[PDB]
């Protein structure tokens, strides 16, 4: 083995808390989130750890509600239970600077984009119309 070099995901690399929350609810309404969950998941606070090993990302996020984690290689499908509990299929693509996550299940479709700004990274989740906005800072 030797050293790989680093890339542009990097700047994603590391342990997030979440520290806002905008319109979350309303998002997970448009999702199809009954109401029990959409209760106790509106209350988390969770920790995003992001990591790359090769060309494997790996995203775990641990929370009082759920604690769920994925890893993938960008462009490449794969079988996701999201928090929630939909079975979803997941294409994750690095545009740009931003990590650009497709779900589809049931026919129909959201977008989770991540991004850096300054020391955050912000998510941004739509579903037709409704956007939520989730600002996470360094652990």
Same mark, same amino acid.
């Given at each position: !083995? ?25 998002? @997970? ?16 606070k969770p920790? @995003?750890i992001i ?12 929370? +009082? ?18 928090? #929630?509990? &939909? ?7 690095? #545009? ?6 497709? !779900? ?6 959201? +977008?989770?984009? &991540?991004?850096?700004?300054? #020391?955050?990274?912000?998510?941004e989740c739509?579903?037709?119309?409704? +956007? ?8």
């Amino acid at each position: !083995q030797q050293m790989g070099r680093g890339s542009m995901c990097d700047a994603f690399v590391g342990t997030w808390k979440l520290v806002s929350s905008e319109n979350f609810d309303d998002y @997970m309404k448009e999702v199809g989130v009954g109401f029990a969950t959409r209760k106790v998941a509106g209350m988390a606070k969770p920790n @995003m750890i992001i990591s790359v090993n090769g060309d494997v990302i790996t995203i775990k996020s641990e929370s +009082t509600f759920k604690n769920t984690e994925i890893s993938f290689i960008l462009g490449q499908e794969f079988d996701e239970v999201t928090a #929630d509990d &939909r079975k979803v299929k997941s294409t994750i693509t690095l #545009d740009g600077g931003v990590l650009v996550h497709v !779900q589809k299940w049931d026919g129909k479709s959201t +977008t989770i984009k &991540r991004k850096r700004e300054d #020391d955050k990274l912000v998510v941004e989740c739509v579903m037709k119309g409704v +956007t939520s906005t989730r600002v996470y800072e360094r652990a």
